[PDB]
Design a protein around this ligand. Structure first.
Ligand SMILES: [Ca+2]
Ligand SMILES: [Ca+2]
Ligand SMILES: [Ca+2]
Lengths: 145, 145, 145
């Protein structure tokens, strides 16, 4: 269709414009096909999950070095640790994404994880490395869409 | 078309991402197919209408309990009354949306409306109930898109 | 396609909603098919170019009176001059857009340009008129998408 082609072009341009504005003003960070954003609040794991789902997204989880660096830049920006989208398996030391799949990419701080099963959550330090920790602390809420 | 399907999927995802960011940061509230947002300014009815149309929208008007609660949450958030998108008919006590249609859903504070035709505008209290009032007061500008 | 028509309508509405929110909150200004926005930072020409490209856009450049007035309103809003997307040719007095094409629309302050080739950049005063100037000053970063 000849009109369909032009309509799609305009639609794609408008999306580029809206995403460009959000990017320019630091409202979000786009990495590949993933968009990260924070509301600036520091709350516990359960609360963060609720906030993200309310917005139509999920708690952020890095699956590549580039995504990890992006979340880390936000942690650094707000000078606060970030809870990530993963929880410990029944077997201590093993973690899984919230959908149940086993974690692949990892960036544990040397020595971590070592909570012996008592720290089922994972927090990201400002340098981007990870630490298994309890889930009741107040951490920066970072979501992915 | 095989490429049209993938293009639309990506377009829809990007929209979800941009709307998710705006939602997460409290820049807007989505209720069904309607989006509410405020610039935080408190001005009169005529001014609000101009501001909304300038942005490509219209003065907010709740047509369902869910929409009413959404606008109320914004009123509460900014601790200020909100002018709604309706004005009094020639017959006192009867109101109409700006397009001329008679108002259906209402949420008048007990006793309202009772301006006897001297208060053609409608303001929303922070608890979400309505009050007919003059149109020259300074009220939170809430628009719908 | 009967479903394609409805899908496009919804997509276009969502775009209108997201753009309406950004417009209402002063996050951007739309003029025709062009969107202008600033991150509020004041840096040199090279830095501005980087910031804009990072966001998926380019340094703003007015090509019509309407676009010029839009950028001027932003300069006025932030009370700071704005570097524009153009640089001087090898021949003093002649300027070109960054893609190499010769500038068409101009709005030089009376007497400008007169840097004799020593001021290859162009800054916009808050009244919207232009002045050729060095490229190392700190100016409001305004991008176009
Ligand atoms: Ca640990
Ligand atoms: Ca009354
Ligand atoms: Ca000069």
């Amino acid at each position: 269709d000849e009109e369909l082609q032009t309509e799609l072009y305009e639609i794609k341009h408008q999306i580029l414009q809206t995403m460009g504005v959000l990017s320019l003003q630091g409202s979000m960070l786009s990495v590949g096909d993933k968009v990260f954003s924070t509301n600036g609040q520091s709350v516990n794991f359960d609360t963060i999950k609720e906030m993200c789902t309310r917005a139509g997204g999920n708690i952020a989880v890095p699956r590549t070095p580039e995504e990890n660096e992006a979340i880390a830049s936000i942690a650094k920006k707000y000078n606060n640790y970030v809870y990530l989208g993963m929880i410990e398996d029944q077997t201590p030391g093993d973690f899984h994404y919230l959908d149940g799949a086993s974690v692949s990419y990892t960036n544990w701080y040397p020595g971590e994880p070592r909570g012996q099963g008592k720290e089922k959550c994972v927090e990201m330090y400002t340098d981007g490395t990870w630490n298994d920790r309890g889930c009741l602390q107040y951490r920066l809420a970072v979501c992915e869409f």
